[PDB]
């Protein structure tokens, strides 16, 4: 939880890191989205790419991003510590992120967080000894109408009950990758028990278009 770095045998400037040749190709595409002379705009996506390859960001990975884009390391350090999606210490294979802001809290996100801890045997902020799961609370994830919900890696699992999230975790242990989305019966954000709108077939091209076009 600290915002100062101390060298350790497993995280120091001589920790091995380097982009793969395939990932170097992606960096060029990233760097070409921004005007020439403003390459520093690529720090966030390139730093995120380093995390996608390595799972997290050692100080060596940050130094490499600074080196490639030719920005001071401090400016990369500032970015890595500002945004909460960058992992500056190793996390588990499955980073379980439970939303606990008020809209999800109102719909009993507490029972979800409790169920995960009881099943995994860990506490919030901890990693399992087998290093398969890391559990943390997070702020609103932009899926409030589908609360309570969690994000595991890149996927949202929504409309959860303690039963739903235990099956999801059991699938992850089994190696199966569960499908994201609501587990209650609806497919997305539509009201449960049937659409109250958008039930009629949609109008086609040119419907209601004003005169002059």
């Amino acid at each position: 939880a600290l915002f100062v770095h101390r060298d350790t045998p497993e995280n120091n400037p001589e920790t091995p890191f380097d982009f793969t040749p395939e990932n170097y190709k992606r960096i060029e595409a990233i760097v070409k989205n921004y005007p020439e002379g403003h390459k520093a705009a690529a720090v966030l996506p390139v730093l995120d790419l380093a995390q996608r390859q390595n799972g997290w960001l050692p100080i060596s990975a940050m130094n490499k991003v600074a080196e490639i884009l030719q920005v001071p390391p401090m400016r990369v350090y500032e970015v890595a510590t500002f945004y909460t999606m960058y992992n500056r210490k190793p996390v588990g294979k499955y980073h379980i992120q439970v939303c606990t802001t008020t809209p999800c809290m109102l719909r009993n996100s507490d029972s979800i967080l409790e169920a995960i801890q009881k099943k995994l045997g860990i506490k919030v902020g901890e990693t399992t000894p087998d290093k398969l799961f890391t559990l943390i609370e997070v702020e609103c994830l932009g899926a409030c109408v589908n609360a309570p919900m969690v994000q595991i890696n890149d996927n949202y699992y929504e409309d959860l009950t303690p039963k739903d999230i235990e099956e999801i975790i059991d699938e992850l242990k089994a190696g199966k990758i569960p499908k994201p989305g609501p587990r209650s019966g609806r497919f997305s954000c539509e009201p449960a028990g049937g659409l109250t709108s958008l039930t009629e077939p949609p109008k086609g091209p040119g419907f209601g278009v004003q005169a002059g076009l």
Binding site: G37, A40, V71, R75, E78
Partner: protein
């Protein structure tokens, strides 16, 4: 950063010997004017006071910070080196 101590003109005299008191180590002096500092509204008043009292003096012209050109927007220049890399 306060500038309220740079308004008036001051007259002070040349520094003279201070030595250690053998007993305590305190700083002793034989200069009666060692602490005498006078305040004036203008250098002309200061010079007039110095002249009638027979003191030879040096006048140092007032240093004023020059007006600066400040622009918060230059921090984000499209093509100039004034673009800051952090906030």
């Amino acid at each position: 950063s306060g500038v309220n101590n740079t308004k008036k003109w001051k007259m002070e005299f040349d520094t003279r010997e201070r030595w250690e008191n053998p007993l305590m180590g305190w700083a002793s002096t034989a200069d009666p004017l060692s602490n005498l500092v006078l305040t004036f509204s203008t250098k002309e008043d200061a010079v007039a006071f110095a002249e009638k009292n027979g003191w030879s003096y040096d006048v140092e012209e007032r240093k004023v910070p020059k007006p600066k050109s400040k622009s918060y927007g230059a921090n984000f220049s499209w093509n100039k080196r004034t673009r800051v890399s952090t906030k």
